[PDB]
Amino acid sequence: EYPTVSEIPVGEVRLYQIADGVWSHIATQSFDGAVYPSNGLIVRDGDELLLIDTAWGAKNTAALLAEIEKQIGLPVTRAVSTHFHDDRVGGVDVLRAAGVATYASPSTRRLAEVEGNEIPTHSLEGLSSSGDAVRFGPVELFYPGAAHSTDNLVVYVPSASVLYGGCAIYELSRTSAGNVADADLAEWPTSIERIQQHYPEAQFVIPGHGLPGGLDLLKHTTNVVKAHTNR
Numbered sequence: 001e002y003p004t005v006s007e008i009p010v011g012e013v014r015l016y017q018i019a020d021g022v023w024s025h026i027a028t029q030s031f032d033g034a035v036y037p038s039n040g041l042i043v044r045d046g047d048e049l050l051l052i053d054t055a056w057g058a059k060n061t062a063a064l065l066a067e068i069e070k071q072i073g074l075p076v077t078r079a080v081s082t083h084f085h086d087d088r089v090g091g092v093d094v095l096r097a098a099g100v101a102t103y104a105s106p107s108t109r110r111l112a113e114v115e116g117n118e119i120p121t122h123s124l125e126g127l128s129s130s131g132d133a134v135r136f137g138p139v140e141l142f143y144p145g146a147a148h149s150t151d152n153l154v155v156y157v158p159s160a161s162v163l164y165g166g167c168a169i170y171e172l173s174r175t176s177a178g179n180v181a182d183a184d185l186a187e188w189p190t191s192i193e194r195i196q197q198h199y200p201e202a203q204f205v206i207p208g209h210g211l212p213g214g215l216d217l218l219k220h221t222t223n224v225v226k227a228h229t230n231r
């Protein structure tokens, strides 16, 4: 079963096999007085591993690397952060110290600097405008437009039809937007429409936080985001 928030003490990381050579990583962290789960992705990249997002903090990200070594045993050589918040870049300094080359869009690197968050080393080119897609090893990176944040990326694994939505996509059980300080509520539904249009074949959809689902998570997120904008 997919691990839930109460099953992971803060500081531990679980891996979940989605498909051949495709895993999510699940961690937990405190935020605004509660503890929340958070997802990232791991994709086999030949003899190496590509990491999508940190495990939300230095300690968790160190535990992530240890669990990957224990369970998969291939080196993590590159990591992409899908936006500038701490559940995506928190732990980049640990990754860099471990020998991982860290990447993000120029916007994400800039926003992380402005916010005082950790800054991935390398800039991803070709993602500056809504609808842009680039290949990065075994995945496609897609910028759908502003949503959860202005810089948020999504990631698609063609070999398994896996769509990692990041924090732009909510889990089914989440019925409120909660904290949306950095969101673009007006653009979020349009950005979700671009995801739907670009990845209509997605079979597994991973939200930034919580349980995987299918393309229904896109319509669900639009519902929640709009309901928040109505009142």
Ligand SMILES: O=C(O)c1nccn1Cc1ccc(C(F)(F)F)cc1
Pocket: 031, 036, 037, 087, 148, 167, 171, 174, 178, 179, 208, 209, 210
């Ligand atoms: O919304 C975000 O992206 C976020 N990042 C860090 C903290 N949050 C708030 C958040 C709200 C609800 C959940 C859920 F209950 F779904 F697990 C998880 C996280």
Ligand SMILES: [Zn+2]
Pocket: 083, 085, 148, 149, 167
């Ligand atoms: Zn975020």
Ligand SMILES: [Zn+2]
Pocket: 085, 087, 167, 208, 209
């Ligand atoms: Zn988040």
